[PDB]
Design an enzyme around this catalytic site. Structure first.
Site, PDB file in Angstrom:
ATOM      1  N   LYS A 113      -8.711 -15.291  -6.794  1.00  0.00           N
ATOM      2  CA  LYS A 113      -9.563 -15.100  -5.594  1.00  0.00           C
ATOM      3  C   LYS A 113     -10.954 -14.459  -6.246  1.00  0.00           C
ATOM      4  O   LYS A 113     -10.865 -13.543  -7.212  1.00  0.00           O
ATOM      5  CB  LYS A 113      -9.159 -14.250  -4.591  1.00  0.00           C
ATOM      6  CG  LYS A 113     -10.040 -14.058  -3.253  1.00  0.00           C
ATOM      7  CD  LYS A 113      -9.500 -12.871  -2.434  1.00  0.00           C
ATOM      8  CE  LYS A 113     -10.423 -12.506  -1.183  1.00  0.00           C
ATOM      9  NZ  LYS A 113      -9.655 -11.723  -0.192  1.00  0.00           N
ATOM     10  N   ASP A 241      -7.755  -0.838   7.635  1.00  0.00           N
ATOM     11  CA  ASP A 241      -8.218  -2.150   7.836  1.00  0.00           C
ATOM     12  C   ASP A 241      -7.630  -3.206   6.983  1.00  0.00           C
ATOM     13  O   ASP A 241      -8.037  -4.008   6.623  1.00  0.00           O
ATOM     14  CB  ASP A 241      -9.702  -2.130   7.244  1.00  0.00           C
ATOM     15  CG  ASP A 241     -10.452  -3.235   8.429  1.00  0.00           C
ATOM     16  OD1 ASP A 241      -9.839  -3.632   9.402  1.00  0.00           O
ATOM     17  OD2 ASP A 241     -11.615  -3.593   7.821  1.00  0.00           O
TER      18      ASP A 241
HETATM   19  C1  LIG Z   1     -10.399  -5.900  -5.978  1.00  0.00           C
HETATM   20  C2  LIG Z   1      -9.738  -5.662  -4.498  1.00  0.00           C
HETATM   21  C3  LIG Z   1      -9.300  -6.935  -3.745  1.00  0.00           C
HETATM   22  C4  LIG Z   1      -8.960  -6.366  -2.281  1.00  0.00           C
HETATM   23  C5  LIG Z   1      -7.873  -6.904  -1.877  1.00  0.00           C
HETATM   24  O1  LIG Z   1      -6.672  -6.340  -1.726  1.00  0.00           O
HETATM   25  N1  LIG Z   1      -7.911  -8.388  -1.710  1.00  0.00           N
HETATM   26  C6  LIG Z   1      -6.777  -9.119  -1.617  1.00  0.00           C
HETATM   27  C7  LIG Z   1      -5.478  -9.082  -1.747  1.00  0.00           C
HETATM   28  C8  LIG Z   1      -4.507 -10.007  -1.753  1.00  0.00           C
HETATM   29  C9  LIG Z   1      -4.928 -11.501  -1.515  1.00  0.00           C
HETATM   30  C10 LIG Z   1      -3.956 -12.450  -1.272  1.00  0.00           C
HETATM   31  C11 LIG Z   1      -3.090 -12.609  -2.258  1.00  0.00           C
HETATM   32  C12 LIG Z   1      -2.141 -13.451  -2.385  1.00  0.00           C
HETATM   33  C13 LIG Z   1      -2.354 -14.551  -1.330  1.00  0.00           C
HETATM   34  N2  LIG Z   1      -1.356 -15.848  -1.651  1.00  0.00           N
HETATM   35  C14 LIG Z   1      -1.426 -16.623  -0.709  1.00  0.00           C
HETATM   36  N3  LIG Z   1      -2.370 -16.741   0.340  1.00  0.00           N
HETATM   37  C15 LIG Z   1      -2.472 -17.883   1.026  1.00  0.00           C
HETATM   38  C16 LIG Z   1      -3.688 -18.775   0.746  1.00  0.00           C
HETATM   39  C17 LIG Z   1      -4.054 -19.737   2.047  1.00  0.00           C
HETATM   40  C18 LIG Z   1      -3.306 -15.825   0.512  1.00  0.00           C
HETATM   41  O2  LIG Z   1      -4.521 -15.775   1.308  1.00  0.00           O
HETATM   42  C19 LIG Z   1      -3.408 -14.509  -0.483  1.00  0.00           C
HETATM   43  C20 LIG Z   1      -4.097 -13.375  -0.667  1.00  0.00           C
HETATM   44  C21 LIG Z   1      -6.461 -11.618  -1.241  1.00  0.00           C
HETATM   45  N4  LIG Z   1      -7.135 -10.402  -1.309  1.00  0.00           N
END
Ligand SMILES: CCCCC(=O)Nc1ccc(-c2ccc3ncn(CCC)c(=O)c3c2)cn1
Ligand SMILES: CCCCC(=O)Nc1ccc(-c2ccc3ncn(CCC)c(=O)c3c2)cn1
Lengths: 314, 291
Positions: A113, A241
């Protein structure tokens, strides 16, 4: 300036190879020191009248806290060579939805990401706290697994990449998607969002659909006691949040003709008495957000979150 | 402090370049830009620690496409070049005024050189490269295989890798630096001690002329560039399968001693600034005079 390959991904795929290959020569420290949590490895490439096809001639690549993230992967059960194959054997596939880039590894085990510079600062403000929590729970958690954190500079423009384990399935496709906060100032998926093929629904859409998650009482107990511990960790850090990502795979709708290779860490099968045979995928996302906001305390956000999630079960 | 980063960085840069060069297809023809090109890499680690490499250094390769082509025309594969320099550290030599390293193989030589020799190489790299294609790499001149600049603790040292003129297995017992016009204290003899010692090379009639014809060709390539002050390095091994010593010439049949001679021109690229064609005239007749 149309290109067939995006140089931001090419430089990233280059730098992950270079990082891990040099890391293979550096012995892992016996204990991570507070200096490892402010460390970084950068490298700047300057070719002149010497052009390559996949990479641009002028780029930089930095890795944040290599020893820390190397240790994290280990504790999460990922061999560094398996990490490398998964990110670089084939180009990742692009996904839409999030702000900037959002890539999925070719084996669908890893997620990459694009985050902002304040997100990079928020991780450093709590890497030591996050690591001490992974030690304490032996990696068994619903928090995201932060596996690597990188800066990619191309055309005098810095992008920040963050790699994590995929909370969704390496093979079972998700048919319904929610992002649950438990909040009052209510959350509906916009009209613009809802007409997509896979819209990220929110609290109100969950309720409007009479959505329930049927997993059986033991799995329910393990999941809620885990969720409670993880939340208390965030509360102590004065965080709020955050969200539960909930995916749902319809079993009879199935995957494509693609039917042991990998373990979906965040999956739970439906209960034997469930009205629908389905697979759920659940995880906390968007942690690391402090209470300080320029116009609900972390303790109240948590209690409401836990009570909402507790009731999605049936 | 002396346990060496210069070598440690240089060998890190060579592996990094040959790995990068495996992903760029080698061209079939060169452009004038390739003779002004360069590849620069700067490493800066912060509270990150590694054993061999320091925390901060630079590595610059000069005209990567040209020397890569020169290694091809000299019959050297890039991977065999990579194994040769890096798989085991190069042993040093105390031929001083700069460092002088020999590969673990003994097949290649790594000599430290100055910033003006780097300028001298660039002024004639194309002239040198085209002479190599016309002779199909069959010359007594040195084989320049790669040229790099390593920066460690804010000091720039320039490295030139050449094929080793001496043998990879058979050691040298006498070594001459032949010119024409005496050595102060294997020592490097100057020219008088060739005479004083009644030294003579016996190589056979047929092979003597092939060497001398090529020597005239080579030297005649240098004088067209206003080059003087070159030497014929002569190494000598009294005879009392993996690789080849292409500058070695076997013991002639029926010689006082059966032996092996290693000869090739060194310290070319010195431009007039005693004339080139005179300097030639004296050296050539000098070296023609051993039979
Ligand atoms: C530097 C600090 C960052 C803050 C912060 O905790 N962000 C944060 C944390 C976790 C994820 C995340 C992880 C795995 C995932 N697996 C699948 N899908 C599904 C895909 C459709 C997800 O969305 C997913 C999103 C995104 N953002
Ligand atoms: C960029 C530089 C411009 C000036 C310049 O042409 N220099 C220059 C050229 C060639 C050599 C050279 C080559 C091969 C060799 N093989 C064995 N041994 C024997 C080692 C004991 C050598 O010494 C040797 C020395 C040294 N210096």
């Amino acid at each position: 300036v149309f290109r067939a390959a995006d140089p931001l991904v090419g430089v990233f795929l280059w730098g992950v190879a270079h990082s891990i290959n040099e890391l293979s020569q550096v012995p892992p420290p016996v204990m991570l020191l507070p200096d490892d949590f402010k460390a970084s490895s950068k490298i700047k490439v300057n070719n002149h009248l010497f052009h390559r096809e996949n990479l641009p001639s002028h780029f930089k690549f930095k890795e944040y806290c290599p020893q820390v993230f190397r240790n994290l992967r280990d504790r999460f059960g990922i061999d560094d060579q398996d990490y490398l194959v998964s990110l670089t054997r084939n180009p990742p596939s692009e996904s839409e939805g999030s702000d900037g880039r959002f890539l999925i590894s070719y084996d669908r085990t890893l997620v990459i990401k694009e985050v902002s510079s304040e997100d990079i600062a928020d991780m450093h403000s709590n890497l030591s706290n996050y690591h001490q929590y992974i030690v304490k729970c032996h990696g068994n958690t619903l928090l995201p697994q932060f596996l690597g954190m990188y800066r990619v500079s191309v055309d005098n423009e810095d992008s920040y990449m963050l790699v994590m384990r995929n909370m969704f399935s390496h093979r079972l496709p998700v048919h319904r998607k929610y992002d649950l906060k438990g909040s009052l100032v209510s959350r509906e998926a916009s009209d613009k969002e809802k007409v997509k093929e896979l819209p990220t629904l929110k609290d109100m859409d969950f309720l409007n659909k009479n959505q329930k998650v049927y997993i059986g009482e033991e799995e329910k107990k393990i999941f809620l006691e885990k969720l409670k511990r993880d939340v208390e960790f965030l509360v102590q850090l004065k965080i709020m949040d955050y969200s539960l990502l909930l995916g749902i795979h319809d079993i009879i709708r199935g995957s494509e003709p693609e039917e042991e290779s990998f373990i979906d860490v965040y999956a739970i099968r439906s209960a034997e008495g469930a009205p629908q045979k389905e697979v759920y995928f659940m995880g906390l996302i968007d942690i690391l957000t402090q209470y300080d906001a320029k116009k609900v305390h972390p303790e109240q956000y948590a209690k409401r979150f836990l009570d909402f999630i507790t009731n999605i079960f049936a």
